[PDB]
Symmetry: C3
Subunit: 481 residues, 3 copies
């Protein structure tokens, strides 16, 4: 059953990857007196004891495997070896292991499936680069015992899922059941690699007990590469010769890189910054603490200079909110613009609608109208069509009437001078302000009703200079009238 | 001609860098069954054949060069060697090469200039670190044949443009024209490096054919450095022991770092995030799909929490848009503020302008005026001077008149209580609202015309408490009146 | 005194780290003809002279130390050695050193404290990996002379503050005062490491002069690691095989990562970008030059596409500014929304307030009112409670009166059709518009005063369809009325 073999293989590879990870750290983080401390890996201390100082010397894959139990490392049932590669406080009272690793390289408890699986790790060989005590390790060999090729495929699959690979795979054999009995299987004196196995399966003495030796190069993929072919678990930056700066790491989604504070931060406010190095502050997008509308803990981003003053972003902004009507639909809007403008009819012939009862509005063409180009809306997500919007609010309005010379003196075309001509005022009936649009233009027009008490005459004015408005323009998922 | 030699040198260095890149990848990406797969480089497989398993053993730069064609690799015209270092599908039907590399290390076709240039690669030596089959390679030597010092300068120039350097450069010679004939040129038994060449050019036997051996250390600059002195082509992050997270790489401008999704993303929405790790969501700036105003494909950035709700940025915002007037000029604006305020004249002596025909406005000093500090505008690009802006729109307005006690009861100073005092109302003539500014203050003032029908009296009021406005403030490249 | 010993140890470690940094750069940056140039470190040139080519060959920590002054490097007072590891232009006229390093590995002047401290560097051994001239260096040994264990603790403390560690520490001795006299102290022929020192202090011949040999592995922590355990000083990206792209480095706070332009940038506008790779522009947040409100040099961030057009961010925005009142307090606001709406009373029975003098407003329940859900405010920093805000500005208003059929024809419910029904207009007295709120609702109501000249009748209208408003909604630290 492939499924069964895959589960065994996944557990085997997890063990293998963890042991290799440990070998690949010459400096390790442990807990002493309740705090993290860097120490030399006991593997690489001249004064360490068994099993940390154990080395084999078969640098050539084809050379004789060690037969000496002080050189190879016995593994699995009946051995105590696991305690030296797992945390001291795997149990509350502490094991005989001397190191509280800050992380687990391998689980405290051996994976359950491996307690009686057909394939188990029987022995580990730390191949030394030289003959010194605590020597560097240039290869890690795992001898897997078969409890009597399908497995190689599932092992390779598990390996590729774990960012490791096998330097090679050899067939090994022993005459009995001892860890010291293992030796390379040979064909005419030539050690048998798995690649040569299909061809030579016929001459394989069935009296032997067989196994596989899996070789891992602990330095392969250990370092980040100029060509980018090795992934980073994280990357942290230095300050003053210490790894005290911010860190970047991926979350589980595959989309996000996450910035967190460095150990050197007196405050917890991670920031991504830009610097021109041309004499002014760098600008940072920084995460700071805040509170939500229910006074619950939250955070936000702040764009700031080094004095902590807000800085500027040039961008189109969309804001999303629940519709304030009975709708629970969400709506989008942009930042508005505001324009001050008066209508522009000035003389009686343009201003006065002489038969207002019969008059029909031609807003696209009326004299004195306010006309504007329809804005282009910015990009929106999905899903959500934005409409150009325009509103007009009254800014000044007077019931002007003809003066002695039959002229209208009130004029609101310039906000700074609206009071400058008082006008001859009648009684206001009010104003109707209409906004219309084509595909490309906004049309804003207005009528005003005025009673002239001097002549007892009722007037309707079209687009008068003595009516001005503040025009608001924006884009929204909420449509225009 | 330098220009000619530089072009040859650029092509030579490109070939060299590509071969070295290949050597420096023990694990490579190939295409099999239409998909990318990681395999061991055939250079480092015990079962590979010629030319992948070819090694020389001259680790010392001064030791004898190989004379054995199964050790060195013959290169160039008359050899088939290029097919093993180029893609199988360099031609549609496939070459005899067995590997479809996912990328080209060197071009399918040898650079045209090198077909008959004065300087060509004649032979390549993969110097083995040990005597095993598929041994690691600690040096790559390129023997360049001269078809009869200027070139060394252009070679070094080309090398520096390609992030590689020469471990050393030796003069080599042969008596005839065979690739196996090359040997180190010597001066009194001492192999001649290019640095020693100027001094010893005189004793150089003119009967020989000469060449240069260029040595490259494939591990030099291979890995990213703690001190930052090696550039990254890209950097990708891991998830669960796989290189499945997001990637960062530069675009061609030299200004931009670009974030793209990882192979593990179920969606394509790359994000840069901040995390306080204090119990609430991380915040992400994420790129999502959208549509532009013409319904064409586009994208945008979304600041969101892990529930996908928009999050908050504290910042000054500038928005750019085409002027909605006939101008095609672009304009900038900021986010406005809104303020509710009533004018504040309450009693008759302050309110009534007794000789309105003669009265001249003193807006900087008039009682009841609305006065505000002029805002500071944020930073703007270039190029684009921002002006403080202010507008006022009518929020409530009534034609109040004196009551029995000669008082004005209408009062709009508090929006929540505007209807609370009805007032004794006359007929409205309207209002003129003016906005003025000094360098530091905004002045908002107003006159209102009212006819009192009870006493048949016409009034002009100054800055009345029964006129209120919504004041909008913002900054813009569009100037104030 | 610990404090004294710590200061000596800090200076010793600084010297050590700098020398090791130099050893760890095979390619170095120097200044020649006024510009930065990469060259091979003189340590690794076959043609270099003393002291660069000096090597010892004791690869085994326990093997005999060199006695040859052309192998070890004499250090300190009486030697000239420092000039070869410091900049040529440590003095203006230039030293006899041949290299202007672009950075100082160690200070021009030896740290003052080390001129007569009890512990000094007496000698340095560059342990060669092989027997070639300019060989790579696999270990750097520093022999520290005691001028007659406390120091080991302070040395280790200084080392951990500098991202370096000791491979080991040995006790050494000499019979006299010569740099060539040093040898490993032994106990029964076994070289004495510091770890064994406590046990064996008793048999230590007091006639000798003692010292400590500190061994550093120059490759330990040299490269960035897949597991993220080595910090980066900086990281720069490549373009076209050159380290020409942008760089990231931490500032001194521990919170910030800073992006700066690459050497390949023709402009100085560093950007962080997102790319979907789905056929449209990548989006970049780019830093550009600008000017502040006083026309002083500044910068800002611009969100743009590859054509340089502003792009879109979906987010909640907070803007901070000084209160424009006498307050110097800062205030926060959000981006407003705008809504056009008319009140909705249409027939006389709803519209006319028949006894307006006695009528009390019931705004939560009045017919024709405008009612909206109160918005939720976004997250705010600290510190700063946001309030929902709402204002209303007049958009159209007419003094409508009953027609022949006793109906009111004026209707502003649709902005695009406000002029469509003219109405029968009286004289406007004005309008009082009130805004109130519960915890969950906004209530907007209005009264209008109108005089009907046809019937000489004075009217007060409630929430009339011939009054419309533009409603602005936003959140602010400035409270609502």
């Amino acid at each position: 059953d492939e499924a069964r073999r895959q589960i065994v293989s996944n557990a085997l590879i997890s063990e293998i990857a963890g042991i290799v990870d440990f070998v690949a750290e010459e400096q390790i983080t442990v807990i002493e007196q309740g705090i993290e401390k860097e120490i030399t890996n006991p593997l690489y201390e001249q004064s360490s004891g068994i099993p940390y100082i154990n080395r084999t010397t078969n640098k050539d894959l084809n050379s004789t495997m060690s037969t000496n139990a002080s050189e190879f490392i016995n593994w699995g049932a009946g051995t105590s070896t696991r305690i030296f590669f797992t945390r001291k406080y795997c149990i509350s009272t502490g094991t005989q292991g001397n190191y509280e690793f800050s992380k687990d390289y391998i689980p405290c408890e051996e994976p359950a499936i491996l307690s009686n699986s057909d394939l188990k790790i029987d022995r580990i060989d730390f191949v030394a680069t030289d003959n010194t005590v605590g020597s560097a390790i240039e290869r890690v060999d795992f001898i897997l015992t078969f409890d009597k090729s399908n497995y190689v495929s599932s092992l390779e699959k598990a390996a590729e899922q774990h960012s490791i690979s096998f330097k090679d795979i050899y067939v090994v054999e022993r005459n009995s059941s001892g860890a010291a009995g293992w030796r390379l299987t040979t064909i005419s004196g030539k050690p048998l690699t798995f690649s040569g196995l299909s061809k030579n399966i016929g001459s394989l003495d069935k009296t032997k007990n067989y196994g596989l030796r899996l070789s891992i190069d602990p330095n392969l993929g250990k370092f980040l590469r100029a060509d980018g072919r090795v992934g980073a678990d994280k990357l942290c930056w230095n300050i003053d010769n210490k790894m005290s700066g911010p860190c970047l790491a991926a979350d589980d989604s595959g989309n996000n890189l996450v910035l967190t504070k460095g150990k050197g931060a007196k405050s917890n406010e991670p920031g991504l910054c830009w610097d021109l190095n041309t004499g002014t502050s760098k600008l940072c997008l920084t995460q700071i603490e805040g509170k939500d509308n229910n006074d619950k803990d939250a955070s936000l981003i702040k764009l700031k200079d080094d004095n902590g003053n807000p800085a500027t972003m040039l961008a189109n902004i969309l804001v999303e909110e629940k519709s304030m009507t009975d709708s629970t639909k969400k709506e989008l809007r942009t930042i508005p613009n505001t324009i001050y403008a008066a209508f522009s009819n000035s003389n009686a012939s343009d201003l006065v609608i002489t038969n207002p009862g019969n008059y029909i509005g031609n807003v696209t063409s009326e004299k004195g109208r306010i006309e504007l180009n329809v804005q282009d809306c910015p990009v929106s997500p999905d899903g959500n069509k934005l409409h150009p919007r325009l509103s007009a609010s009254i800014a000044s309005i007077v019931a002007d009437t003809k003066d002695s010379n039959g002229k209208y003196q009130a004029d609101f075309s310039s906000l700074a001078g609206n009071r400058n001509s008082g006008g001859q005022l009648g009684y206001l009936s009010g104003t109707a302000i209409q906004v219309n649009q084509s595909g490309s233009k906004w049309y804003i027009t207005a009528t005003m009703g005025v009673f002239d008490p001097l002549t007892n005459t009722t007037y309707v004015y079209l687009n008068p200079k003595f009516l001005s408005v503040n025009i608001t323009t924006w884009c929204s998922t909420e449509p225009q009238t």
